């Protein structure tokens, strides 16, 4: 999972993206 981060950029930044998304 993690697509929600790149799809939101700064809106996706958060511990979730930090651990589930290499995009923030």
Swiss-Prot record:
PTM-bearing positions, type Cysteine amide: 24
Highest rank taxon of the organism: Eukaryota
Compartments where found: Secreted
Disulfide bonds: 5-17, 6-23, 13-24
Expressing tissues: Expressed by the venom duct.
Record annotation: effect of changing residue 1 to A: 3.5-decrease in blocking SCN3A (K(d) is 710 nM)
Free-text comment on this protein's domains from its UniProt entry: The cysteine framework is III (CC-C-C-CC).
Note: Negative results: does not or very weakly inhibits rNav1.7 and rNav1.8.
Family statement: Belongs to the conotoxin M superfamily.
Function summary: Mu-conotoxins block voltage-gated sodium channels (Nav). This synthetic toxin potently blocks rNav1.4/SCN4A (Kd=0.34-3.6 nM), rNav1.2/SCN2A (Kd=13 nM), rNav1.3/SCN3A (Kd=200 nM), rNav1.1/SCN1A (Kd=360 nM), mNav1.6/SCN8A (IC(50)=1.8 uM), rNav1.5/SCN5A (IC(50)=9 uM), rNav1.6/SCN8A (IC(50)>30 uM). It is noteworthy that the toxin is 50-fold more potent on mouse Nav1.6 than on rat Nav1.6. The block of SCN4A is very slowly reversible.
Protein name: Mu-conotoxin BuIIIB
Shown segment, full-protein numbering: 52 to 75 of 78
